[PDB]
UniProtKB/TrEMBL annotation:
The protein's name: CRISPR-associated protein Csc3
Residues of the full protein shown: 651 to 813 of 975
Domain of life: Bacteria
Length: 154
RNA sequence: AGGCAUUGAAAGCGACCACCAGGGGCACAACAA
């Protein structure tokens, strides 16, 4: 949103926190889960995402994983992505998470209202059988009232 | 009015067609205490 925060304390324990205005859990977890994979990929830092005000304190081999996610909504467990990740796994995780977000927002979403309350069903069909990726594409087409995909979407 | 004589060979189907389009999710609810 050349330093501008020079009066603020140096962050030895750097915590960042989310707020959302629909009241459900999957809606609460979609931005933290994305941020908790993302910030280690941008900055090489180690993340714990939790509801807990007390953290796990990190040290020289507590550091043996890059990310922990304490108790994510069940869309996470349904994707089968680990709740704890070593640094090599973070780009596989960001790929699966954005691939399911960019597939949920195509069908079972509306342009001003993302309807993340339905994300567990979009994950469960994609994981059951991979051709359901095209079943979701086709749902998108019908919402969009379009009979055929663009050449790019194919 | 009589005897006689109530039938006979062959054929018993042949061609073509055994479907056509279009739809194959639609809505919402993902926690409550």
């Amino acid at each position: 949103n050349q330093l501008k925060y020079t009066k603020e304390d140096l962050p030895f324990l750097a915590t960042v926190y989310t707020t959302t205005r629909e009241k459900t859990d999957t809606d609460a977890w979609v931005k933290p889960a994305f941020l908790a994979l993302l910030l280690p990929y941008l900055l090489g830092v180690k993340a714990i995402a939790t509801r807990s005000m007390v953290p796990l304190y990190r040290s020289d081999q507590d550091f043996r994983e890059s990310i922990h996610l304490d108790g994510v909504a069940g869309f996470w467990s349904l994707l089968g992505i680990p709740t704890d990740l070593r640094v090599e796994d973070i780009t596989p995780a960001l790929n699966k998470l954005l691939a399911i977000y960019t597939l949920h927002l195509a069908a079972r979403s509306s342009p001003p209202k993302a309807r993340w309350q339905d994300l567990p069903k979009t994950v469960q069909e994609v994981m059951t059988d991979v051709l359901n990726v095209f079943a979701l594409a086709e749902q998108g087409l019908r919402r969009e009232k379009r009979d055929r995909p663009y050449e790019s979407e194919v």
